[PDB]
Amino acid sequence: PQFPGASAEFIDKLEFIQPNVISGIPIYRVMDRQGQIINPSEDPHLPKEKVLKLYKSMTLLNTMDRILYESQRQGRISFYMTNYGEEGTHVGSAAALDNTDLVFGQYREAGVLMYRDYPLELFMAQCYGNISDLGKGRQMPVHYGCKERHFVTISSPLATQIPQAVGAAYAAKRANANRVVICYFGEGAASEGDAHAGFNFAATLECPIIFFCRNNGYAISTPTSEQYRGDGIAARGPGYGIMSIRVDGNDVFAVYNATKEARRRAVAENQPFLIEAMTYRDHPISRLRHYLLSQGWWDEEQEKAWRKQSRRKVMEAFEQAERKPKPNPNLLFSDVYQEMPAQLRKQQESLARHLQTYGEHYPLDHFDK
Amino acid sequence: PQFPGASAEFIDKLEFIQPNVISGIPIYRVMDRQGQIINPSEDPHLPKEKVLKLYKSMTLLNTMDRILYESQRQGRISFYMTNYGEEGTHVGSAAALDNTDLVFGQYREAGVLMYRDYPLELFMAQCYGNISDLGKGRQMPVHYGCKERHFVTISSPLATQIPQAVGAAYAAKRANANRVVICYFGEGAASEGDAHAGFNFAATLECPIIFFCRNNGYAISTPTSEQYRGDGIAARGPGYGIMSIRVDGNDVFAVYNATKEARRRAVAENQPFLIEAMTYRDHPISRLRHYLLSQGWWDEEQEKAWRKQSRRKVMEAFEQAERKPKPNPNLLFSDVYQEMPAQLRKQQESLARHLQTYGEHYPLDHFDK
Amino acid sequence: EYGQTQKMNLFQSVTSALDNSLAKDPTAVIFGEDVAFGGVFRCTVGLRDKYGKDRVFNTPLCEQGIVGFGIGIAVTGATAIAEIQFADYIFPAFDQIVNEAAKYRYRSGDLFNCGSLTIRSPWGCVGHGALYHSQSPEAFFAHCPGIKVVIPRSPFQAKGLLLSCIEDKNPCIFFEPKILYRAAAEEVPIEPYNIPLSQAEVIQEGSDVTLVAWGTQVHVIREVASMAKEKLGVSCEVIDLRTIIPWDVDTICKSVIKTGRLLISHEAPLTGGFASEISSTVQEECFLNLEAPISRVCGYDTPFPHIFEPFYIPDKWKCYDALRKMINY
Amino acid sequence: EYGQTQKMNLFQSVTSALDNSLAKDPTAVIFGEDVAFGGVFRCTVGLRDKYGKDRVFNTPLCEQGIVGFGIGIAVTGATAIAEIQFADYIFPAFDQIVNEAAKYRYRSGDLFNCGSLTIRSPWGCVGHGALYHSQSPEAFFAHCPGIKVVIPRSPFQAKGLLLSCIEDKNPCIFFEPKILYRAAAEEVPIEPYNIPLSQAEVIQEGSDVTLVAWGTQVHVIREVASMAKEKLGVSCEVIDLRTIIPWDVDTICKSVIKTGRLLISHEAPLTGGFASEISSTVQEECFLNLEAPISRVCGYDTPFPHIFEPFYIPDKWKCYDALRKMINY
Ligand SMILES: Cc1ncc(C[n+]2csc(CCOP(=O)(O)OP(=O)(O)O)c2C)c(N)n1
Ligand SMILES: Cc1ncc(C[n+]2csc(CCOP(=O)(O)OP(=O)(O)O)c2C)c(N)n1
Ligand SMILES: [Cl-]
Ligand SMILES: [Cl-]
Ligand SMILES: [K+]
Ligand SMILES: [K+]
Ligand SMILES: [K+]
Ligand SMILES: [K+]
Ligand SMILES: [Mn+2]
Ligand SMILES: [Mn+2]
Structure with missing residues (x-):
């Protein structure tokens, strides 16, 4: 065969290629539901202090979720997306990254920020859009961003970060400072055309990026039987020439091993990797707990003490957030462009005049200056 | 494993799944370069009259290409896209379809119209945008359409027809009259997000559609090494749960067998099929010629006579096209909406007035009324 | 005026229009993200049980594909009522809308059309929706010859305008002010009725x-x-x-x-x-x-x-x- | 005024601007469909041989991906000069342009930005381009706070306006009137120079x-x-x-x-x-x-x-x- 599009032999028999869906890409697991390491040769033997940091980040994230979720139900904040079931994927993968690796994601990635030590007061400031929000109160709650922690500000439109992440990985390659980009998205977001753009560009442009797809069987109400008919998202990787694997998202050690190894090869080889972590819409926290217990690294007393301390750290940050003023309304006009166009200043000026005369009708009491 | 997104076992060993690119999906072939049937059990034994119709449609298409291409070079028409190397994919696949199967495509599908007996004068009318164009002269040359022959009008934006074709297949399913849709596109167009949309919707909505991808190794200047890194487009089908095959696009019999069998199963099972036909940017016409000769169905004399008759049919249609007037300029305003909005009539009326006064400055001589 | 009426809020008047459409037009289907269970604003509640899973169904999460798919249905003459979950997310479909739906009839000399397409979408601010749950995209579409853009102000206006968009033989975008979905109700006729398009x-x-x-x-x-x-x-x-x-x-x-x-x-x-x-x-x-x-x-x-x-x-x-x-x- | 000049037509004045950019800004890359061999309007001729295949390169045929990829480059501070082959095909990128590039700085409180992005694209009629080789999309973009849209009238205006768009710290669309690519030439300076944006x-x-x-x-x-x-x-x-x-x-x-x-x-x-x-x-x-x-x-x-x-x-x-x-x- 002499065709430039494909390397292949002839076949002289008509045979359609069938998807293997019933017996799909198997799910990599390191520890069972009792926290037992299943195959010692796969054990990462993470040191105690790091593993406890994993546990504590997962649980502190869960405490904050509980509080902010209830806050949403009471109408004190307008929107919340929790991390339940996603603590393991996010803390375990973040731990395998370098601190300066650039992270793109969307709604279930607060675990990454938590592992990277983002202050509770800042998760709070964004949710309340208060003066302490470096996002200046402009986006809906849970749209976190941190330039210091290399965490690209979340946006609501699904899958848009995927080809952007590939660009940032291309740019990193050129800069030659050994960094990877990771890009998280859900299985529903993987149906958008921007996922096909990102996947394809990453392979043809040879970019050091890890695609991390979290598959929980649902996109809002839509089960996966209605989202795709192939063997999940992992089965799609090899079709773009991307090395792919599927892991148990309830096993922090399995997420960690796959992420660590993807990072090593992506960076060395300038090639993309796809990790599909399976989760539920048995739980990453309890599974790691059973592991801590069996090593003698945790116990009931420590667990109750930590539950109490984390609750109070969260509530201290919560109460302080609720009490801060919102930013000056002047800030609705800045950062539209880097500079402020004169015609936009003129609109800023019209609001100032408007509030001089009609301000009694606006909630000026809560906003700074 | 209890995850709703995937049916799979656990694995206890970290193993990334690798693409098989060097040894890809093999290329289905029926007849060799000498027109010899390679494996008699795959022979379609098409009757002589049909096979001659294939030959004659391929060659007449090639004659028209030669003439219109030269016409473009001389500037008598503004644009032309030829069918060289694509005659086999298009005539062989059209022949496997029912006449009422709906066809979507783009620039290399005139072969389908030719097999379906679209008059030469109408291919010409569209290229010249003359009064006989049922497209009313509105689109660039080669943007053919025929409602009678079930051939959806071509548009320039690549890949847009792919999810549209899936919709028309869904609608056909509901109507229950045993029809399939076929959708042709190139390997470059398969990189657009609309291809990922179409492929995915076809599988989850269970649509009777054949995706026909023509892979010639290039999209304008861009070789496939720059277009994708997986094993061509066929390798992507199984990832969407779509049954896929790759064929020799220089072998009309191989294109015919795969198309026929895809149509049978798509219609029966309400499921999509993907055919990737490999071609060059050895030739479908000569290969079928060697087959005709070996059956005793053609010869030099018949070939010279047909070359002469087809040249004259084409030139008769050509000269007549060139001599017809273009449509009335009134027709630039109709069909924008079904009805014409009053504000659009008002603009029609302003042109009429404008031409009353300034008409000497417009090429009114060539346009009807 | 229009027979028996019932107090409906805007979401209810939407479901009423959609139900009336499916009842009298056997070709009509409704599809988009999460429409099967009733939709995230409850606009399609009860309609899949009533009319069937082949007529009211979920697509994958892909807006360009939702509109392209809808255009293909409409090309066969069938009524396609697509939903985009927030008007803010209609932009991935902008090329299908503007380069394709809008131009389909013109460019074919009226050999083909997608006039049986309607795209309905939540629109306008909502108090707390910020950048991507608040947008009013109508002006982006206004510069595109070949589509109709329609926006009602109340439950009664909504049902009659949506019925016209559904039945009109041109591709229509119907934008539903989401802050009114559950606001005050007004009397709305149970049976179908039309309010004319292009009329203030x-x-x-x-x-x-x-x-x-x-x-x-x-x-x-x-x-x-x-x-x-x-x-x-x-x-x-x-x-x-x-x-x-x-x-x-x-x-x-x-x-x-x-x-x-x-x-x-x-x-x-x-x-x-x-x-x-x-x-x-x-x-x-x-x-x-x-x-x-x-x-x-x-x-x-x-x-x-x-x-x-x-x-x-x-x-x-x-x-x-x-x-x-x-x-x- | 601006040093040694040379007769350039518009395509030539474009290559001159792009060459000057790559020469003085080591981060800059140019990418899009068929730019490596010089581009379908010859606007990038000679630039890949001169500056390297990692700096002037072809992407897959995917406009949403071209713009999304360009935004990601620019997020790291590197200059990304994307090309869309005809302005008519910019619409698949409309969501990246309008929901993402345009809003990137605002929505992040200036923690992140894509100001080092420029998207250049052929524009306007050409005598025979019909529906999809003729469009002028500027008004669709004009309703989008956060992007700049710029359109020159001649070779000299083109190079100086393109240099400003490339160097400006906001995402810019530069539309190149394609019917002028090979029209009359005028004197254009060889070395870089700027014409101000937002100035008639x-x-x-x-x-x-x-x-x-x-x-x-x-x-x-x-x-x-x-x-x-x-x-x-x-x-x-x-x-x-x-x-x-x-x-x-x-x-x-x-x-x-x-x-x-x-x-x-x-x-x-x-x-x-x-x-x-x-x-x-x-x-x-x-x-x-x-x-x-x-x-x-x-x-x-x-x-x-x-x-x-x-x-x-x-x-x-x-x-x-x-x-x-x-x-x-
Ligand atoms: C472009 C766009 N369309 C639709 C939505 C509405 N939406 C917000 S979350 C979501 C489901 C996403 O599911 P998945 O990606 O699987 O993430 P998960 O919620 O399961 O974690 C949808 C449809 C959106 N934000 N963006
Ligand atoms: C949306 C869009 N982008 C770019 C183009 C310009 N274009 C016309 S043909 C072509 C190459 C298409 O290649 P492929 O799909 O492989 O078809 P082939 O020409 O090889 O038959 C390109 C980029 C277009 N028409 N539409
Ligand atoms: Cl959302
Ligand atoms: Cl084109
Ligand atoms: K996003
Ligand atoms: K098309
Ligand atoms: K309609
Ligand atoms: K710029
Ligand atoms: Mn999900
Ligand atoms: Mn090609």
């Missing part, structure tokens, strides 16, 4: 000034009419445009010819907003009647902010103050 | 009427200025807007304040075209000076036709006739 409605007559708006902002300018009459003894003529394109140029010029003054208002940003099209047209046809500059009271030229929403929107006070100055020009 | 240019002063246009249509209204002076002894002030947003409101009002009359012209369709934004603004700021209605002479509200192009475009005769009536209003 004068909901209050007046003599001193014309006010034009659409969607939720119609209730804003109704209150401004009250304020003005009360505070300034100024008689406002209040007009709901309803159809963005093709728009009712005639009704708006007739009014401005009578009053001599115009204020247009919309939540979308000023620059390139649809108020500039109405403004420039009105100026061309009514130039000799204009007593004062045509005013546009619109959102600022910024993205739509979360926490600063109260200061962003063109509320009754912004509009009243603009009207005041215009009266004294 | 008065290329001919006059006293009776103001004419505004951009791109190729600037040469149209220059000829209309000649016609008018010759046939009517009417003194036209001729203005090239250049930047669509943010636009030079000041220069245009100053002129209309002097002349009392305005005609705006563009190839894009009338309805929702950018002329309505200039018209409505000028009317608001210059109301008491207007001697006659502001005229808009634009393409009709239809898709752009193949064979009927000569009758579609707002040519010198259409404009002259509109000016005539305006003079006699």
